Design a protein around this nucleic acid. Structure first.
Ligand SMILES: [Mg+2]
Ligand SMILES: [Mg+2]
Ligand SMILES: [Mg+2]
Ligand SMILES: [Mg+2]
Ligand SMILES: [Mg+2]
Ligand SMILES: [Mg+2]
Ligand SMILES: [Mg+2]
Ligand SMILES: [Mg+2]
Ligand SMILES: [Mg+2]
Ligand SMILES: [Mg+2]
Ligand SMILES: [Mg+2]
Ligand SMILES: [Mg+2]
Ligand SMILES: [Mg+2]
Ligand SMILES: [Mg+2]
Ligand SMILES: [Mg+2]
Ligand SMILES: [Mg+2]
Ligand SMILES: [Mg+2]
Ligand SMILES: [Mg+2]
Ligand SMILES: [Mg+2]
Ligand SMILES: [Mg+2]
Ligand SMILES: [Mg+2]
Ligand SMILES: [Mg+2]
Ligand SMILES: [Mg+2]
Ligand SMILES: [Mg+2]
Ligand SMILES: [Mg+2]
Ligand SMILES: [Mg+2]
Ligand SMILES: [Mg+2]
Ligand SMILES: [Mg+2]
Ligand SMILES: [Mg+2]
Ligand SMILES: [Mg+2]
Ligand SMILES: [Mg+2]
Ligand SMILES: [Mg+2]
Ligand SMILES: [Mg+2]
Ligand SMILES: [Mg+2]
Ligand SMILES: [Mg+2]
Ligand SMILES: [Mg+2]
Ligand SMILES: [Mg+2]
Ligand SMILES: [Mg+2]
Ligand SMILES: [Mg+2]
Ligand SMILES: [Mg+2]
Ligand SMILES: [Mg+2]
Ligand SMILES: [Mg+2]
Ligand SMILES: [Mg+2]
Ligand SMILES: [Mg+2]
Ligand SMILES: [Mg+2]
Ligand SMILES: [Mg+2]
Ligand SMILES: [Mg+2]
Ligand SMILES: [Mg+2]
Ligand SMILES: [Mg+2]
Ligand SMILES: [Mg+2]
Ligand SMILES: [Mg+2]
Ligand SMILES: [Mg+2]
Ligand SMILES: [Mg+2]
Ligand SMILES: [Mg+2]
Ligand SMILES: [Mg+2]
Ligand SMILES: [Mg+2]
Ligand SMILES: [Mg+2]
Ligand SMILES: [Mg+2]
Ligand SMILES: [Mg+2]
Ligand SMILES: [Mg+2]
Ligand SMILES: [Mg+2]
Ligand SMILES: [Mg+2]
Ligand SMILES: [Mg+2]
Ligand SMILES: [Mg+2]
Ligand SMILES: [Mg+2]
Ligand SMILES: [Mg+2]
Ligand SMILES: [Mg+2]
Ligand SMILES: [Mg+2]
Ligand SMILES: [Mg+2]
Ligand SMILES: [Mg+2]
Ligand SMILES: [Mg+2]
Ligand SMILES: [Mg+2]
Lengths: 86, 199, 122, 80, 133
RNA sequence: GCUGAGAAGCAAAAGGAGGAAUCCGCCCGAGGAGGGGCUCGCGUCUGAUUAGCUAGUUGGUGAGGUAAUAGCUUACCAAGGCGAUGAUCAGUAGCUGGUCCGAGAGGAUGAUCAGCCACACUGGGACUGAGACACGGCCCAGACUCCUACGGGAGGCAGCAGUGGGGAAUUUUCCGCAAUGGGCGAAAGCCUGACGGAGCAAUGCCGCGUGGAGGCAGAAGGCCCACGGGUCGUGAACUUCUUUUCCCGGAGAAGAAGCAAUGACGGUAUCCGGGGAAUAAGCAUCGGCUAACUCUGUGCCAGCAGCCGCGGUAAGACAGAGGAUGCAAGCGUUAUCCGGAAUGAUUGGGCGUAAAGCGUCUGUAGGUGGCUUUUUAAGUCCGCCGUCAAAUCCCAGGGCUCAACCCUGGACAG
RNA sequence: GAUGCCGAAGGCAGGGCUAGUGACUGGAGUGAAGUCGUAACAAGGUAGCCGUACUGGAAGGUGCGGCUGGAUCAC
């Protein structure tokens, strides 16, 4: 399906990262949307990603008792690069 | 499961009920004690309406209820659909065709296997009749004799336009579905529908 | 009131509390009478009411009302109790079904007989 | 293996079968992969949807005697 | 001014209940469009724009008193729906209709703002701004 | 084919039928479908008078292990992981299609029927095998029952019946493999307490009956009565018609599938004849809510009651009688759940005096947040596809004489 | 056959949680009628109430602050 985009809370460990993914859900009864946040152990060979990074999160085989997810380069995001002003 | 009790009696309290009795009530002779309940609670008016219906067709309550559920289901005006359903009963059609004296009579007639609907014997009163249907007497001496005498000796020619009757073999024919104006009684179905809001 | 506050689970129901805890989700229970005696009703209803104490199978001891007119019940009799409340007598939440087990039917009652456990007269 | 057989529906004394493609180890009325035929003795009603039948006979579904001979009467074994 | 839409609505409701024909409201793409629509439905007499100190004001003339101010059979109701707390959306087959259609429902959709009528013609759902009686 | 960079190294078989043709098998690969194993998003009860929990624990390497990925194991290295959006701990609970209720939104529940999980006297092991950590297999320990010639053995109904016991309460130690489904067999066939059927029970839902028509307006009797009469009551008695049901005789299926044969149900369902109104109505209530009223007996007694409350001499509320009313082969009482209850409120309430604004501020998380243009497209919207098993609910036909029930087809929701 | 590792009951020991029970004791609730008093509701016979401290058989009393949900008079 669609992969999950998030930001990194912890880089400290080797070949891994700890991502936080925020999603909104329409709470079952009261029809307002809510932010629920979940954390993941993402496998990141090469340790390219630092803390604060905004990374896309992908699915693969189990690497550990926790990490199922491949850390993957940010998928599509709006350029924080300045644009013309006509 | 049938009302075998005193009839005249129910008639005094309800109103005029064709499917029950042809004998017009006694003067009523209650003019001595002059006993009334005062007037009737709105509830009692509703109740007496339903009872009118129920005893005219010889239906039990638990049955009437299920007719009413079938009614609320049906897409259409509820009281009307109900009155349709009640008026399509085999025994009642057997009655309104003059093939019977009254509804307990017609009912008995059906029970004893004296009637045919499209060349097949139906012995149950509540069999629902559908358009283009043949109402015949079984070909035996008894069946024919019954139908003949009760048909001929009763003069009423009121046949309500959806009902055909044909002379020697005595083929009755159900032509179509009842019209609200052709209904078999004076009843505001509105009151009955209302009574049944709580089921 | 505030949406954000309801989303913290601010609406919780009050559960249904039974009027007859001693039965434990049953139509009847059987018990043995520990005692059979009279009590006076809360004023202004004056009379003498026939109540027994019954020790049940579910282990409880309760005080059950005995209906009708007169009775044969005495201690170490095995009766059948059912629910329902006598608004007169404080604490009495249970009746005793007549005509079953050790309670006989009321003698000579002609009307509403099924409520008292009496045969039809021939 | 996959079997094409009858599952028994309807009521007491009046019995009506569906013809179904189902794994041989599920119960007689248990869950299945595909519903295919319809059968009935008393109304002498019988008919089948053949594209499915053939697509299962092709992947190696084995029929049961009764069914076998139903497919026979309807000439599905010739096309095969 | 946490909600701008609700506020416009309110200024109307208030000026209406007090039997004044004239209201000052603060303009915006939303405001302007809503008022346009209000005019083409016919709930309001006339609109116009004003400007001072880089502020825009739509003044609204309002339907005259009903055959006196004391004896009023009719008022002109307004109700916010989707509001910052809970946003209400509807597909095509849930699109609201008001008092059998006597009143109107405003919708913001992909094709811009409209009434429920337009939404039904074009087959679109969207965010329900408010109802009007 | 498998190991391996390679060099190389290493691995298989089974015959039985038939006179022969040929058949069923056997070994090694490579596919298919079905059946299992794993991994992850989402959804999946109450408790803060449960606040910190976790050290193979969270990750890294090396060696092992598994059918396969994995702290699955082990050694070393690192210090993580989870947690006030409720971790851990305690308490309850099999879950889901569904069922019941609700105008809807949603509440309560998870019998039968169908899917999945888990378990097999209480705990732990493995073995065999494609598949088990195996209900009617093995081993051990324990608890319990039996047999024993005393040295030793045997066993596991939460399989179908059945017995004790607990309990308000839940059935025959039945017939049959004829149908469908399984197992093995070349087939003939054998075995199937799955299943197909019967029996018992108003437990429930649905159908039918207990008569139909006529019946002086005269008589017996009950009850009321200002003694005039009223009412039970066209009700019965009475006269005719009819026979579903009952009784006594006859014939007698489909269900069986393409060679005939083969039916537990069963001589049952149905059909033809002969009698004969003949064989068949009870139960609640009658003070208000709530449809239906009077009289005799009692006297704060005996008793009734869902709530208000009735009952101290004329009780429409007690008990009896007559009468009426409601339902009807059922009618009531109790238990359980939802409703009504807008009484836990999103739709749908409140907080000056009725229950309810912290004593007042500052402020962290969290929620909401002015206007204009552009971008993006996460929500949002529209189209198309996959799926949300069948059964159930809903619509449209069809079959059992009707209905309940069964069968075919199709679909909104979400 | 023996032996190592892991190992279920079994043993001991201290924990946490909960179940039952216990001399006696503290208060709560309902009991027409008993005792003592009469605190509250009228300016309730000393205005009442809130917090708090001290005392009193008991309702209470007084102090210190606050409020009117205080009557009388002031308008
Ligand atoms: Mg019935
Ligand atoms: Mg009666
Ligand atoms: Mg019949
Ligand atoms: Mg209702
Ligand atoms: Mg309730
Ligand atoms: Mg045939
Ligand atoms: Mg939606
Ligand atoms: Mg070799
Ligand atoms: Mg041979
Ligand atoms: Mg040979
Ligand atoms: Mg649940
Ligand atoms: Mg280690
Ligand atoms: Mg459990
Ligand atoms: Mg409701
Ligand atoms: Mg069970
Ligand atoms: Mg099952
Ligand atoms: Mg056991
Ligand atoms: Mg093996
Ligand atoms: Mg297992
Ligand atoms: Mg086994
Ligand atoms: Mg066993
Ligand atoms: Mg058993
Ligand atoms: Mg027993
Ligand atoms: Mg017992
Ligand atoms: Mg047998
Ligand atoms: Mg067989
Ligand atoms: Mg077979
Ligand atoms: Mg075979
Ligand atoms: Mg069976
Ligand atoms: Mg019987
Ligand atoms: Mg029955
Ligand atoms: Mg029976
Ligand atoms: Mg019973
Ligand atoms: Mg039973
Ligand atoms: Mg008669
Ligand atoms: Mg005859
Ligand atoms: Mg044959
Ligand atoms: Mg006959
Ligand atoms: Mg009344
Ligand atoms: Mg009574
Ligand atoms: Mg009740
Ligand atoms: Mg008196
Ligand atoms: Mg006297
Ligand atoms: Mg008297
Ligand atoms: Mg008198
Ligand atoms: Mg009485
Ligand atoms: Mg009586
Ligand atoms: Mg509610
Ligand atoms: Mg609200
Ligand atoms: Mg309120
Ligand atoms: Mg107050
Ligand atoms: Mg207050
Ligand atoms: Mg304040
Ligand atoms: Mg404070
Ligand atoms: Mg602040
Ligand atoms: Mg902030
Ligand atoms: Mg913001
Ligand atoms: Mg804005
Ligand atoms: Mg389905
Ligand atoms: Mg239909
Ligand atoms: Mg039909
Ligand atoms: Mg279907
Ligand atoms: Mg869909
Ligand atoms: Mg005391
Ligand atoms: Mg006393
Ligand atoms: Mg005083
Ligand atoms: Mg004083
Ligand atoms: Mg005072
Ligand atoms: Mg002093
Ligand atoms: Mg002093
Ligand atoms: Mg003072
Ligand atoms: Mg102050």
């Amino acid at each position: 399906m669609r992969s999950m985009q998030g930001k990194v809370i912890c880089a400290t460990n080797d070949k891994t990262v700890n991502v936080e993914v925020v999603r909104l859900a329409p709470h079952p009864k009261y029809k307002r949307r809510v932010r629920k946040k979940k954390k993941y152990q993402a496998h990141d060979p090469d340790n390219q990603f630092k803390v604060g990074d905004w990374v896309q999160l992908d699915k693969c085989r189990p690497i550990s008792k926790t990490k199922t997810f491949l850390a993957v380069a940010p998928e599509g995001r709006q350029s924080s690069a300045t644009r013309p002003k006509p | 499961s049938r009302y075998r009790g005193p009839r005249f009696k129910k008639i005094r309290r309800l109103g005029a009920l064709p499917g029950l009795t042809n004998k017009r009530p006694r003067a009523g002779s209650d003019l001595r004690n002059q006993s009334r309940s005062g007037k009737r609670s709105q509830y009692r008016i509703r109740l007496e309406e339903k009872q009118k219906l129920r005893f005219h067709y010889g239906i039990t309550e638990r049955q009437l209820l299920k007719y009413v559920r079938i009614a609320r289901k049906a897409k259409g005006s509820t009281g009307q659909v109900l009155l349709q359903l009640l008026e399509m009963r085999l025994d009642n059609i057997l009655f309104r065709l003059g093939m019977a004296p009254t509804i307990p009579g017609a009912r008995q007639l059906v029970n004893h296997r004296h009637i045919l609907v499209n060349g097949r014997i139906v012995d149950i009163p509540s069999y629902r009749c559908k358009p283009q249907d043949t109402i015949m007497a079984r070909d035996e001496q008894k069946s024919i004799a019954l139908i003949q005498n009760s048909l001929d000796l009763s003069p009423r020619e009121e046949l309500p336009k959806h009902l055909t009757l044909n002379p020697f073999p005595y083929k009755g024919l159900v032509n179509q579905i009842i019209d609200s104006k052709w209904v078999g009684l004076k009843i505001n179905e509105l009151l009955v529908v209302e009574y049944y809001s709580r089921q | 009131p505030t949406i954000k506050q309801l989303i913290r689970n601010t609406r919780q129901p009050i559960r249904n509390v039974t009027k007859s805890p001693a039965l434990r989700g049953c139509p009847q229970r059987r018990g043995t009478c520990t005692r059979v005696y009279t009590i006076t009703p809360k004023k202004p209803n004056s009379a003498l009411r026939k109540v027994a104490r019954v020790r049940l199978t579910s282990g409880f001891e309760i005080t059950a009302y005995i209906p009708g007119i007169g009775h044969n019940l005495q201690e170490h009799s095995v009766v059948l109790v059912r629910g329902g409340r006598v608004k007169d007598l404080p604490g009495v939440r249970y009746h005793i079904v007549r005509g079953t087990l050790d309670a006989v039917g009321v003698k000579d009652r002609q009307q509403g007989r099924s409520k008292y456990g009496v045969k039809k007269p021939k | 293996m996959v079997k094409l057989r009858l599952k028994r529906c309807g009521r007491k004394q009046r019995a009506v079968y569906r013809i179904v493609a189902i794994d041989v180890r599920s119960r007689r009325e248990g869950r299945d992969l595909q519903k295919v035929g319809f059968y009935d003795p008393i109304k002498s009603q019988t008919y089948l949807n053949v594209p499915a039948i053939l697509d299962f006979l092709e992947k190696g579904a084995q029929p049961t005697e009764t069914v076998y001979d139903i497919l026979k009467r309807a000439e599905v074994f010739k096309e095969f | 001014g946490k909600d701008t839409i609700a506020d416009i609505i309110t200024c109307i409701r208030n000026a209406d209940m007090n039997r004044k024909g004239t209201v000052r409201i603060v303009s915006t793409n939303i405001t302007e469009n809503i008022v346009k629509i209000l005019l083409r439905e016919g709930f309001i007499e006339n609109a116009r724009k004003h400007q001072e100190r880089n502020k825009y004001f739509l003044v609204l003339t309002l339907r005259h008193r009903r055959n006196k101010k004391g004896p009023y059979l009719n008022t002109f109701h307004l109700k916010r729906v989707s509001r910052p707390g809970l946003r209400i959306y509807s597909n095509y087959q849930r699109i609201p209709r008001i008092l059998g259609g006597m009143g109107i429902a405003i919708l913001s959709t992909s094709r811009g703002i409209m009434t429920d009528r337009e939404a039904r013609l074009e087959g679109i759902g969207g965010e329900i701004l408010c109802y009007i009686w």
